[PDB]
Design a protein around this ligand. Structure first.
Ligand SMILES: O=C(O)CCCC[C@@H]1SC[C@@H]2NC(=O)N[C@@H]21
Ligand SMILES: O=C(O)CCCC[C@@H]1SC[C@@H]2NC(=O)N[C@@H]21
Ligand SMILES: O=C(O)CCCC[C@@H]1SC[C@@H]2NC(=O)N[C@@H]21
Ligand SMILES: O=C(O)CCCC[C@@H]1SC[C@@H]2NC(=O)N[C@@H]21
Lengths: 118, 118, 118, 119
């Protein structure tokens, strides 16, 4: 259920393939941020999630460099997939920019996002 | 550089190879939590960091499933490499557990960790 | 705007008073977690907000001790009030438990919540 | 135990009084950030902690407005006090700026800070 195209409320587009092994592979297109076009993403997910009614833990990273720009920054999303008619991926993310040590205290933004199929 | 074997204050072991395309690949061994032995990790880093003195942004993900057990959870570390005194990776992390919907509100732990090579 | 009774998605109840000097006071009632009935809260808000459509920064804290039980934990919410149309308060929160040193790595939960008066 | 002057690595200084009922009151002096002079802080702490060696949960807020300036932003620190020979306050913090709706995605910084009785 994770492989495919997912959207967040901010207008970004996450295209993923979930390998049989636990790999997450794909591209991210950010609607906001110092970004343009697609960026490589790589991640991991629980390929044998709980057999009750729990989501599927996952995580992925995008470093914000591609052929057109480099934002000298990296976002990790940590969350879980919840399947069904309104499948979704509920995440929290951390966006760290490379900084001088004097500015390291403000290197990291924190946010959250729910991704959907529509 | 970032390729190498790194350790945090807890004694976990992070073994990573940074590839030229921006890929991070390796294994992670947790000194605490619902884990044993090594776990696959994958992530991304800025392959062309600023020369201005800033760190190098990166992130990586561990899904806490391997051959011996499955914690149904995933941690992402978001941070920057500092090829500084000791070189170090300063991170913040998010550990998300697959939960039921009623428990999603407590799905995610947050913490921070500095890794060094000794 | 801020002064009022607010609810989050979890159905918890946030009853707050904004004093004219930047003080937030009131009670919090959690619908989930190791809590029951009302808990004291206190916090601070920007009493002279930007007047450029920006939100009103604020935060508040609940220590989860009251006459009925004590969870030995405390949550802080950090967010901004957005007035107008449908007023809401958008937050991120940090729930820290008193733990031993060895368990401090898992002492803190993070989440997010939007409060509305509906 | 918590009452007194506390220092972090950034050079900021936090003065706090822990009330018997659980209130935290005082001022925070930041040494980095869009900040000058002292700022009011208020918060709460577990005033009947575990005696088992476990830390004392607590949190506080600073709205970064005082008589000298206004950063239109607020920080909350969430953490636990650990007493002893080497007392400290182990925290994580969220600093939220007021922002337009379209900028909300980047409204909040996250960080961590250990406070000590000695600089
Ligand atoms: O601005 C940068 O440093 C690079 C672009 C970051 C875009 C962020 S990642 C979190 C949020 N969700 C998105 O889809 N875009 C932003
Ligand atoms: O869900 C679990 O218990 C497995 C998580 C593994 C341990 C966590 S990840 C963050 C922190 N750093 C470590 O080295 N271990 C813990
Ligand atoms: O369980 C505890 O340690 C004390 C109660 C904490 C409840 C949390 S605070 C964040 C979230 N929002 C709520 O309304 N309840 C939970
Ligand atoms: O810049 C602002 O928006 C107001 C001041 C922010 C200062 C931050 S709060 C977290 C960290 N700890 C400090 O002592 N200063 C910074």
């Amino acid at each position: 259920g994770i492989t495919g195209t997912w959207y967040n409320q901010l207008g970004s587009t996450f295209i993923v393939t979930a390998g049989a092994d636990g790999a997450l592979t794909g591209t991210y297109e950010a609607a906001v941020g110092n970004a343009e076009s697609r960026y490589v993403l790589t991640g991991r997910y629980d390929s044998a999630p709980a057999t009750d009614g729990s989501g599927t833990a996952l995580g992925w990273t995008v470093a914000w460099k591609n052929n057109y720009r480099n934002a000298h920054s990296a976002t990790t999303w940590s969350g879980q997939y919840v399947g069904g008619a309104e499948a979704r991926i509920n995440t929290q993310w951390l966006l760290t920019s490379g900084t001088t040590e004097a500015n390291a205290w403000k290197s990291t933004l924190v946010g959250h996002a729910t991704f959907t199929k529509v």
